[PDB]
Design a protein around this ligand. Structure first.
Ligand SMILES: CCc1ccc([C@H](C)CC(=O)N[C@@H]2O[C@H](CO)[C@@H](O)[C@H](O)[C@H]2O)cc1
Ligand SMILES: CCc1ccc([C@H](C)CC(=O)N[C@@H]2O[C@H](CO)[C@@H](O)[C@H](O)[C@H]2O)cc1
Lengths: 809, 809
């Protein structure tokens, strides 16, 4: 039907139909009389999977023959979403499968909705890993993603009485057709035990063993016949484990719990033993696999053949594990091993909030990983000796830079370990990388300036344009061809269409159709009823104080109060949508969700408001929901306190899909405005420098309450029970925090935010000029392709050259 | 190569080769360069499986169209063994697959050895269920086996220092290609809670829910294109289960533990809560499935369309569950529901030892299954009212027959429940069925004589002749054709060959080749070195006192002592092989294994003995080992105390495969001797009547020790440390039991056993007359086909007619 979706050849359609029927019969063991839509989904998934395997086998054979440098991307999170459509896109099979299924009497879009998300991450960090795998395959890199196969991913969110409830995400219940178990490559991982010193070095003995069984998932590049591998480890007990008899068998669950569940606490560190076990488990299995593959081609060449990228500090134990293997098992001297390790490892930092930093109690490492603690102490002493030689007499620097933190409980700072043991350290947007050098890692930058880099984040335009917004992809392809899908800088060519009346109309029509489709989805699956002519004002991301969903709430209540004050005045109609999950233990985040639904309960049923203002909490935000709502949005809310959002990536998804952005000069918002032009962005609020000046003087929220009558009215409404009639004090914790303990200065940006929102409403009244500004945003989004990001990692960190050349089919 | 293995057509071989290569590539995702023998096994299994599915779908569709009476065989155990060869046999594909794999450069027998046994049973009861499924498919019955999918089956036995060690049987580690998960037919099962009485009947409320997910395995009939289903349930927690957050997810394991592990204690009852949960779990899921299938065609017709066979009392909760469903949910009056239940259910008893009987504490049922306890009390009161009307004034009968046992702890006798609620009760051999009527169920027989039947056990001649002994099957087929494989009574025709010199030679040659093959297997996999010209004297079965492995040990030591006394006298050389697992908690059984290995340690290294006597403990006895050793045996040891082995089925396997039997007149041994003629059997020892007379007088083992010098010598050797030099008192528990507390009267049959063994040795010296007697055994083994057994259940209990007619391919 549409061009970017590829050819529907007669031979291809015929072959797909026969393979579909073959899988239904032989694989699923059904016939058409008993088959449900889920059976049909599985028959299609197996049919598409078959087209991957030839390319998968020949890619891995190709890497064996050519022996390129291998890139290992270690992450505790891979937020993959659904696989069926992405695979069809990358293999150019979408139109052929659409035709084949149509001829069999099925609707393919309906079958696509049956697939579960692979929700093996929390948010930005996990989804970045997923975009990165797609770009690495698309750029022809010999790359492997390594992680954990969690039995339960991020919880499903239900809203009950306005409150978040969590339920287990049993994503494997019906099977996962994309993975292949590889029980033959199972590897042992050791825990506990003790260290013995022989004449022939240290030995780690009397350990408990857990097995790591790998499952491999294919990662297709875009139309290049490259298929890379994501290998996820699953925990298994050995067969003599604990080996009354019955209890010993039931206790195997204790070992296997390592891979049971994803920790859902993001940007807040909890020193839990089970989490530490997960981190070591992925590192120990992965490194054995790396070394095996290297030997099946002298460790001096190891850094020429291996790169290990640490996605935050979560896999930081790779550093002392690599040392352990090289020194204890391979018998290299320390200095040689350290050289190899540093040249192999590189570390990406994703946050600056101090409570998010991993600082493990020494006593936990002592008991679980006694040899690793010894190695970390040795690393620390040698490192501090270099610091002392460079900055003689600076004793406070020695205590600041130490890997060991002294105090009530001694802790290991894993960020300091990563910097010491990596040849490169990067932040994820220009402003974040600068902040790392000027503040939290200042001392390290002064010692080793050459280590510190920037790699601004990006998103894959396969999933985040072609897949989720085919209408937009098509009207763009009509004008400039298809090459932009793997070379996103070509969207700059669209600037020559900013005055083209046909293009203006088509861009606006695509948005309108996306909005109608989403408005329909809402009624169907959630009995909620919205005006599709309203401005769609959207803030979707995990719930955190720093992201300031509360600032958005203050604006919504302001709009509501202004309507009630002058009900017969015209205002631009809005549908304000907020969605995202809260970490189960984070009380304030749970109260914020409740506040949002409470505001909706009042606003959405006030007859004077009519359909001029609606407030909807989007339940169970996840990758498959992002693919639906982002194409429908008019306004993207990116309103974190300046200096707190390291980059953001949702921001980039909205820009690519034809929404304008209201935001602070934070994370990648700075670079987005620089690319598009500040005139084409809705920037407001304090810059980082203004936040610093306020902290020096002392933030006093009372001052804002005293001087801004509209703000005072909202606080009095919250305090008095206007949004919670039966429980008048329900939101007192929120009010108390805002008035006395607000680390993120919500009131300080309120006045500027409301004024900026008025400028948004004014532009939206002129459809033609709104759409021209949109075109200027889409046209300058190219820098934010993860293909650009990965090309920079490849050349500046990993020392490998990307390639757009096809492998042969 | 051999005829009974079917045709190797050019078209068929070509098609098998292409499908094998297809699975290797697309299913396994390998190529020939990296593939291991296990990959090749899986490629073959998937290729053979594809030939099942068409027949499976069309069989189940056939039953839907024709709506025959359905037979539901409920068992906690299905001891299936390996599936690949059995499937090839039943589909006539063995020679074609042999050719196809040969042409691909692989040896099929080697690939067959890779498959794990499905060890979902302990021994005789579990293996009977498996033979029965094969016969039911072969006879065209619309039959379903229902059980539990244990994650861990019967443990793997390792022998360390002569002692049994248990390790977990992780049989699913590499996947199971034969099963199909059916998560779409998942059903809820309830536990705990409480009963509320409304005006509209009882209600069971506030329960905990566990989900039952079914996995279906195909069961092919012999060359009739029938493929029936074995449905095994797996326990899953619901997704709101327990729904700190982390602990709630980890605690899902508590629900899922129901299906984790097979209880390995056979013939000894332990009232464990987890076992009771397993029994209810299988019953509750199965009955919902039965009722659903019945409704998808008025409960008066239920017994016309449904038969439920209870394999011992393990699924006895079917009786009150069916009542619960009919009365509480469907609102039938009690009397009508009871009529339907009795006409639907039938019960097979498999033992007479009182410690094997299930007697559940009332307090466990009260807490776990409060509504079922109420129903059982009501059943009991109505039943005892009938007893009182039939035998007025007989108050002791009322207490003997009660389902409720009074005492320290009140218990429910599940055997009494089964008799009360079934229209038929059967034992498993003629002598056992008579014992049931005369002793343990005498009172019930007097009340309802029409209920009591016999169904003598049998074995499937597909697995237990064609599959495991193709050489024998072939020389038989040469003379009488192939029809005997599904009509085993035709082996009687072999009596006309008892004087045929060619047949005599071929029978003896087949045995010799089987012995050479087994002797080789021993060296290869277990570095043990035997004389293949010796008489192979074999006792394989679970280790129990009643089976008297100890009596065999006394004979072995007698032979050894006789050699040492007259070393230069000729004796017929023997290899004595004993194998079987002991229940983990059964101390005496563990000591018996140790004694057997201890005897071997002395005997096998005495240079004066040479290769005249060897004693080997066969480690990890299981179905796949039985298939190897039984064809190789000369002498089958079936030496239980008269009245203790309900039937035996190993006895029948040996008879069919050309071994002679030394045995007591116990279980099916009685019928085997009756069929073959007592002259052609080696019968010894007390009959049941003699055991009774000894018990009346009182068994005094000292008397035998005082009067039999050879026996006294052995006891002194055991006591003094002759078989345990470093631990002289190691076997004192054994000696103490034999001398003072022997329930099974080992000494009382010793003299007769030794004399009978001398008569065995004498016949073995005349190869020609040994072989003629063998022919007379094989020729009269037909009655012991499980096809005969199932035809009798069908006609006399289930009320359905068997059929040998092919369904169309
Ligand atoms: C120790 C608990 C924990 C778990 C996860 C994390 C992640 C690093 C949180 C995260 O997702 N950070 C986000 O990373 C994205 C990809 O670089 C950025 O775009 C976001 O700005 C950043 O918040 C921190 C702490
Ligand atoms: C409650 C523990 C428990 C578990 C299993 C059993 C089974 C009934 C034991 C068993 O396997 N009995 C055997 O059943 C075979 C099939 O009918 C007979 O051939 C054997 O004689 C009988 O011992 C009893 C008690």
């Amino acid at each position: 039907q549409i061009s970017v979706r590829g050819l529907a050849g007669v031979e291809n359609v015929t072959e797909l139909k026969k393979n579909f029927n073959r899988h239904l019969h032989f694989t699923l063991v059904k016939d058409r009389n008993v088959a449900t839509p889920r059976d049909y989904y599985f028959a299609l998934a197996h049919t598409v999977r078959d087209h991957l395997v030839g390319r998968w086998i020949r890619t891995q054979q190709h890497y064996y023959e050519k022996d390129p440098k291998r890139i290992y991307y270690l992450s505790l999170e891979f937020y993959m979403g659904r696989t069926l459509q992405n695979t069809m896109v990358n293999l150019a099979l979408e139109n052929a499968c659409d035709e084949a299924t149509y001829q069999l009497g099925l609707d393919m879009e309906e079958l696509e909705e049956i697939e579960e998300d692979a929700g093996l991450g929390n948010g930005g960090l996990g989804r970045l890993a997923a975009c990165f795998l797609d770009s690495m395959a698309t750029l022809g890199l010999a790359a492997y993603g390594y992680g954990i196969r969690y039995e339960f991913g991020i919880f499903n969110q239900k809203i009950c009485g306005g409150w978040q409830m969590e339920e287990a995400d049993d994503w494997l219940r019906y099977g996962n057709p994309w993975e292949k178990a590889r029980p033959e490559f199972t590897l042992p991982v050791h825990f506990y035990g003790r260290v013995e010193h022989t004449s022939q070095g240290a030995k780690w003995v009397d350990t408990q063993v857990v097995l790591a069984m790998p499952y491999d998932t294919p990662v297709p590049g875009y139309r290049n016949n490259v298929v890379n591998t994501m290998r996820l480890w699953s925990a298994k007990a050995p067969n003599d484990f604990n080996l009354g008899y019955i209890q010993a068998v039931l206790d195997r669950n204790l070992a296997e719990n390592i891979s049971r569940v994803l920790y859902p606490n993001d940007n807040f560190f909890e020193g839990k033993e089970l989490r530490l076990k997960q981190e070591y488990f992925v590192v120990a299995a992965t490194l054995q696999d790396i070394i095996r593959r290297f030997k099946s081609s002298n460790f001096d060449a190891f850094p020429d053949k291996v790169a290990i990228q640490l996605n935050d500090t979560h896999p930081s134990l790779a550093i002392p594990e690599l040392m352990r293997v090289l020194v204890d098992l391979e018998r290299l001297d320390w200095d040689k091993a350290w050289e190899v390790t540093v040249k192999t490892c590189a570390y990406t930092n994703h946050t600056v909030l101090p409570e998010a930093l991993e600082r493990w109690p020494v006593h936990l490492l002592e008991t679980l990983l006694p040899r690793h603690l010894q190695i970390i102490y040795e690393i620390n002493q040698r490192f501090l000796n270099r610091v002392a030689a460079a900055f003689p007499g600076d004793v406070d620097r020695l205590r600041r830079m130490s890997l060991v933190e002294e105090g009530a409980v001694k802790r290991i700072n894993m960020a300091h370990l990563c910097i010491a043991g990596s040849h490169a350290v990067n932040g994820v947007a220009r402003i974040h990388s600068e902040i790392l050098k000027k503040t939290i890692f200042k001392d390290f930058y002064e010692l080793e300036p050459h280590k510190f880099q920037n790699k601004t984040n990006g998103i894959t335009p396969r999933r985040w344009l072609v897949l989720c917004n085919p209408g937009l992809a098509e009207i763009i392809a009509e004008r400039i061809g298809e090459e932009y899908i793997s070379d996103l800088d070509q969207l700059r060519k669209l600037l020559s269409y900013v005055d083209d009346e046909a293009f203006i109309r088509d861009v606006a029509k695509v948005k309108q159709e996306n909005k109608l489709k989403f408005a329909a989805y809402l009624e169907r699956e959630y009995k909620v009823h919205i005006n599709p002519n309203s401005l769609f004002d959207v803030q979707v991301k995990r719930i955190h104080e720093y992201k300031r969903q509360l600032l958005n709430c203050l604006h919504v209540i302001t709009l509501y109060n202004r309507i009630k004050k002058e009900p017969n005045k015209f205002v631009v109609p809005r549908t304000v949508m907020i969605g995202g999950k809260a970490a189960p233990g984070y009380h304030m985040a749970k109260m914020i969700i409740k506040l949002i639904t409470a505001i909706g309960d009042v606003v959405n049923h006030d007859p004077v408001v009519g359909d001029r203002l609606r407030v909807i909490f989007l339940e169970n935000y996840r990758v498959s929901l992002a693919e639906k709502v982002i194409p429908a949005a008019d306004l993207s809310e990116q309103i974190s306190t300046a200096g707190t959002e390291a980059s953001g990536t949702g921001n980039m998804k909205f820009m690519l899909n034809g929404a304008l952005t209201i935001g602070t000069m934070d994370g990648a918002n700075v670079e987005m405005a620089e690319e598009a032009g500040e005139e084409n962005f809705f920037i407001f609020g304090m810059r980082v420098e203004d936040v610093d000046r306020l902290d020096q003087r002392g933030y006093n929220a009372q001052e804002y309450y005293d001087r801004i009558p509209e703000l005072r009215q909202i606080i009095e409404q919250l305090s008095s029970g206007f949004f919670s009639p039966k429980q008048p004090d329900l939101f007192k914790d929120i009010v108390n925090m805002l008035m006395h303990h607000d680390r993120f200065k919500v009131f300080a940006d309120y006045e500027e935010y409301v004024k900026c929102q008025e400028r948004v409403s004014a532009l939206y009244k002129n459809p033609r000029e709104w759409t021209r500004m949109v075109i200027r945003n889409i046209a300058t989004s190219g820098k934010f392709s993860s293909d650009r990001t990965i090309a920079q990692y490849a050349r500046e960190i990993w020392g490998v050259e990307p390639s757009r050349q096809r492998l042969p089919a």
